[PDB]
């Protein structure tokens, strides 16, 4: 039940090297319902961006929402998500999979790009975790 904007934000310091995520689950009437920022281990920015999305996607389904629209900085996610682009890379193909077994779980979902300064608060979420690593 319900609809959520779920923000979404990887952070990391190599290819690979130390990697952060943050999420945001907001309502419609604005107020945050939930946030998280964790560190990952080690991972590419791609890789970050996208347990960003599926840590996103986790919460939201927790708390039984119906309708998701997630937002986010990331063209790599959002065109992959999509189905734009396909990749050859096994691992991200299998947080693609990852991230449709999830949304399949909400009777609808959309994404959008939002410029990073729009996504502050998952990049704080992130950065501010990756910053104590
Ligand atoms: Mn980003
Ligand atoms: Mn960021």
Known sequence: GGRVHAYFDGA???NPGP???????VSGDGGIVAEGGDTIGRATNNQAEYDA??????????????D???????????????????TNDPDL??????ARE??????????????????????????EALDDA
């Open 12 to 14: 990391s310091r190599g």
């Open 19 to 25: 990697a952060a995520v943050g999420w945001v689950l």
């Open 53 to 66: 999305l599926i840590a996103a996607l986790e919460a939201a389904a927790d708390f039984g929402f119906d």
């Open 68 to 86: 998701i629209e997630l937002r986010g900085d990331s063209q790599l996610v959002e065109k992959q998500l999509t189905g734009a682009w396909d």
């Open 93 to 98: 193909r299998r947080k693609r999979v990852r």
């Open 102 to 127: 999830l949304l399949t779980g909400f009777d609808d979902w959309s994404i959008t790009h939002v410029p990073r300064a729009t996504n502050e608060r998952a990049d704080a979420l992130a950065n």
